[PDB]
Amino acid sequence: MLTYGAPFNFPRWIDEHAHLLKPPVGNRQVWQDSDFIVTVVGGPNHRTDYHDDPLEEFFYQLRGNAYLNLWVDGRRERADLKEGDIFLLPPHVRHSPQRPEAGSACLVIERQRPAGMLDGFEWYCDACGHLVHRVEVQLKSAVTDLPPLFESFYASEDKRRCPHCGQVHPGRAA
Amino acid sequence: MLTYGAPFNFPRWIDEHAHLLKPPVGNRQVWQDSDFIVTVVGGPNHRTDYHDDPLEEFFYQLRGNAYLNLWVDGRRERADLKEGDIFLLPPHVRHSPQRPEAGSACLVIERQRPAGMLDGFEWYCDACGHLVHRVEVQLKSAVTDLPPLFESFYASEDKRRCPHCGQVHPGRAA
Ligand SMILES: [Fe+2]
Numbered sequence: 001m002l003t004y005g006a007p008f009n010f011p012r013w014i015d016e017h018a019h020l021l022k023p024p025v026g027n028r029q030v031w032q033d034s035d036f037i038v039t040v041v042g043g044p045n046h047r048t049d050y051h052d053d054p055l056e057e058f059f060y061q062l063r064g065n066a067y068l069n070l071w072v073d074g075r076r077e078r079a080d081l082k083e084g085d086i087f088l089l090p091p092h093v094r095h096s097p098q099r100p101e102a103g104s105a106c107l108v109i110e111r112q113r114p115a116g117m118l119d120g121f122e123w124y125c126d127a128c129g130h131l132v133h134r135v136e137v138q139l140k141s142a143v144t145d146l147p148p149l150f151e152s153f154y155a156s157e158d159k160r161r162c163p164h165c166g167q168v169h170p171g172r173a174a
Numbered sequence: 175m176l177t178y179g180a181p182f183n184f185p186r187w188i189d190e191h192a193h194l195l196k197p198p199v200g201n202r203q204v205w206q207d208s209d210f211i212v213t214v215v216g217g218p219n220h221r222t223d224y225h226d227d228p229l230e231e232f233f234y235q236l237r238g239n240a241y242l243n244l245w246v247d248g249r250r251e252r253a254d255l256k257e258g259d260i261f262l263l264p265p266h267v268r269h270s271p272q273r274p275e276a277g278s279a280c281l282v283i284e285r286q287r288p289a290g291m292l293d294g295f296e297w298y299c300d301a302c303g304h305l306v307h308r309v310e311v312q313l314k315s316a317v318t319d320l321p322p323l324f325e326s327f328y329a330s331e332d333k334r335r336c337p338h339c340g341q342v343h344p345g346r347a348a
């Protein structure tokens with residue numbers, strides 16, 4: 001009845017998965033088919049997408065430092081995840097995590113989205129701050145659901161084109 | 175829009191709350207009014223109640239050692255939370271956490287129960303293993319909802335009386 005197995009040492013698990021906690025994979029989920037989505041995210045990694053999570057997101061930056069690019073109160077903010085920091089993100093706060101350091105490790109906890117509760121993935125214009133493109137998705141497996149989403153944005157100048165000032169978003173790298 | 179405040183250093187937070195992570199309080203919730211219930215549980219503490227949580231329970235034993243008394247497959251099992259261990263408990267697995275060490279610290283993450291989804295708190299007969307008493311509760315604030323529940327069990331020989339073999343459960347301490 002211990003569907004998720006017995007307790008196990010977390011720092012050693014992180015050490016054993018260090019080759020997954022770097023490009024191109026970067027992150028690895030701890031338990032499968034659970035309501036709590038428990039993930040360890042490594043580095044380095046940079047991204048331009050902002051996530052609109054309809055539920056809360058918990059962060060515990062166990063090793064190394066990272067930071068979150070955020071939209072707060074209509075203003076573009078930064079929240080540092082220094083080593084040892086914990087943080088709870090409220091639903092729908094747009095966030096774009098940047099992880100500059102190799103060997104870094106962050107525990108991220110989410111939970112499964114019920115049917116009909118959609119996740120949003122957004123990009124914003126560096127020139128005028130307007131929203132450039134949003135895709136909503138019924139998230140079942142981020143590891144595989146999202147790479148094709150991101151790739152389709154990078155590949156389309158039309159998706160990347162700002163509707164306000166016409167500036168074409170750079171795509172993959174800022 | 176950062177309803178739960180900015181990130182902060184977790185080990186230092188644990189150090190600053192060490193006086194709450196011991197009797198009589200024992201535990202302290204990190205953020206209030208959040209969907210994710212984030213708690214740090216200290217020690218020492220022993221208990222005879224088993225919890226029937228209708229949702230999952232995540233454990234990260236950061237400092238010191240503890241263990242969980244469990245009911246697994248109709249058999250009374252023990253799952254050690256050695257220092258550094260993480261663990262995900264599936265819904266409805268009956269569990270009774272024992273925390274023998276002072277200075278220990280365990281991160282426990284749950285989430286709010288929707289209306290109508292009840293928590294159970296149970297005691298079992300040491301002599302024959304039968305269920306002695308169960309109370310169901312709409313859990314809103316464990317810190318204050320549950321002490322009167324536990325106290326009412328300790329105070330009533332009738333609640334503590336095993337319906338199978340008549341043995342009166344010892345109450346507070348095993
Ligand atoms: Fe996210």
Ligand SMILES: [Fe+2]
Nearest residue numbers: 125128162165
């Ligand atoms: Fe623009």
Ligand SMILES: [Fe+2]
Nearest residue numbers: 225227231269
């Ligand atoms: Fe529990």
Ligand SMILES: [Fe+2]
Nearest residue numbers: 299302336339
């Ligand atoms: Fe009995």
